[PDB]
Amino acid sequence: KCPLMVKVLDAVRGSPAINVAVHVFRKAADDTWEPFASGKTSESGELHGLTTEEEFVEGIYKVEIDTKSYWKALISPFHEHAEVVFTANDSGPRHYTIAALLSPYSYSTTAVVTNP
Amino acid sequence: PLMVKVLDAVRGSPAINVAVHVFRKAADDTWEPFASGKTSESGELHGLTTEEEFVEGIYKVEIDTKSYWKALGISPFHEHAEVVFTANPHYTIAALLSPYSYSTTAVVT
Amino acid sequence: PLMVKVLDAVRGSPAINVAVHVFRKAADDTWEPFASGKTSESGELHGLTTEEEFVEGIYKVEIDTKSYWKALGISPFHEHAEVVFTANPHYTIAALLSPYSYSTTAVVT
Amino acid sequence: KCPLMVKVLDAVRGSPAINVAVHVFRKAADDTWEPFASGKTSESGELHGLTTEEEFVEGIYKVEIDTKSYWKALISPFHEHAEVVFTANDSGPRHYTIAALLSPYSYSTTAVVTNP
Q1: Spatial CB neighbours of B30, under 8 Å, sequence gap ≥ 6
Q2: CATH code of the domain containing A47
Q3: Are A46 and A16 in contact (CB under 8 A)?
Q4: Minimal Cα–Cα distance from D9 to chain A, Å?
Q5: What separation in angstroms does the CA of C19 have from each of C37, C45, C73?
Q6: Where does the record place the modification Phosphoserine (chains B, C)?
Q7: Phi, psi dihedrals of residue B71, rounded to the nearest 5°
């Protein structure tokens, strides 16, 4: 394998952040954000199967994590969502895990990049 | 009412000369330029806007983290960091930068 | 030369009235009390020490995060947060608190 | 299963933090920190097998992550180590993952607590 994975934790509960919606976009030649993939985290706070090594070509990707819907569905948080934007696969294929740690007024995000 | 502070977690210092662009979501759902600056020597950016123009609405603060790391000779992961929020308490948007990670917090007083 | 700032990531605010204890590692490898205070209304603690007494050495800053969350009616994970470092650039120790997580950064200028 | 696990990431490299030494202590009846377990992270940045459900009784535990040796063994970091101190198993047995994200002048740590 899965070349793009998202893992989300809840810093308030000390648990996986479950049922967090995630939308992925890819910059198109026109320079606009085209829908690329979407899904939601599981009970372990992970999201797999967004894409395939074949479809995940080079490009600029935006991973939007819908944190406000997450918190509301539980609390009124600060951010609308957490947006992770990066160039991918520009030195050849890699695997990416986008990790995010969520608090109502704060989040962090880290990328773990490996080369299968 | 809107302040940006950026810290470098690799050097344990303010992140200086970082470009910051603020946008407001237009009725057409597009992002209109609203304000921009470079962080100061203390990693701070002030006077982006006034209480008058900073009306309720959704805002985006884009921090050009990539140019920052490149200036320092370091290869970073993100294109930029983006903070998106509804203005509806002075807002401080703080960001802590590492090459492959960043954290952002809102201090609303 | 030593400042502590504490933020609450749940409320997006300064963490007020948080007890902070600083210790210095003695030659006997024990931790000697060195300084302590409560964060202010701005989540800040200053005047812990002077340039004179803040000599090189290893220091520990203990932040009583547990009492903080309990005062707010919230069940937290950590007993406290601990920042341990060698003083050898003004040191700002900043901490960002959540019930089950905290981050700490050093800003050395 | 393993009731106490540690996971460490490097925020500079975007990778697991490998060969990070970790020492665990438990507060004794005397109120001093007794050695409880130690180990080092693997190539995936994880450390398993510190202890067993049977030995991991209630108590106050300190997980010390030796971040300075880690960075030096690569850079001169700020902290001596990252120290995670918590009461465990006071409402019955739980499983704990202590996650830490490391930068030379900053770290974060999060607990994920589950009830098998």
Answers
A1: none
A2: 2.60.40.180
A3: yes
A4: 8
A5: 6, 9, 17
A6: 42
A7: -55, -25
Torsion sign, CA atoms A101, C68, D67, D45: negative
Check if the beta carbon of residue D76 is closer than 8 Å to that of residue B10: no
Cβ C49 vs Cβ C22: under 8 Å: yes
For an interface test with D, the pick among A87, A110, A113 (most D C-beta atoms closer than 10 Å) comes out as A110
| Resolution value in angstroms | 1.6
Which of D44, D95, D112 should one mutate to test binding to chain A, selecting the residue with the greatest count of A CBs within 10 A?
A: D112
Tokens 């002048």 belong to residue: D105
Q: How far apart are CA C17 and CA C6, in angstroms?
A: 10
Contact D12 B100 (CB under 8 A): yes
Give me the amino acid identity at B19.
Answer: A
Q: Output the six-digit token pair for B82.
A: 């983006």
Tally the domains of chain B.
Answer: 1
User: How far is it, in rounded angstroms, from Cα D10 to Cα C107?
Assistant: 19
CB B59 within 8 A of CB B25: yes
Cα angle: C76, vertex C80, C82; to 5 degrees: 140
Residue D64: name the closest of D76, D49, D52, D47 by CA.
D47
Q: Residue with structure tokens 């969350």?
A: C69
What are the two backbone dihedrals, phi and then psi, of residue A73, each rounded to the nearest 5 degrees? -45, -25
Rounded CA separation A82/A24 (Å): 12
Selecting from A9, A15, A106 the residue whose C-beta is nearest the C-beta of C9 gives A106
Q: What is the distance between the terminal CA atoms of chain D, rounded to a whole angstrom?
A: 9
CA distance A108 to B14: 18
* Selected residues 83-102 of chain D with any CB under 8 Å from a CB in chain C: 83-87, 101
Cα–Cα distance for residue pair C66/C63, rounded to 1 Å:
9
Domain that holds residue D97: 1-116
Say if the Cβ atoms of C101 and A101 lie within 8 Å: yes
Give the integer Cα–Cα distance in Å for D22 and D45: 11
Contact (Cβ atoms closer than 8 angstroms) between residue A74 and residue C10:
no
- Name the CA radius of gyration of chain C, rounded: 14
Residue with tokens 């492959």: B100
Find where tokens 């009583």 sit: C64
Cα radius of gyration rounded to whole Å, chain D: 14
What was the structure determination method? X-ray
Cα(B21)–Cα(B35) distance, rounded to whole angstroms?
6
Q: How far apart are CA B98 and CA B78, in angstroms?
A: 10
CA–CA min distance D74, chain B (Å): 14
Hey, which residues does D38 pair with through a beta bridge? D23
* D115 token code pair: 């009830």
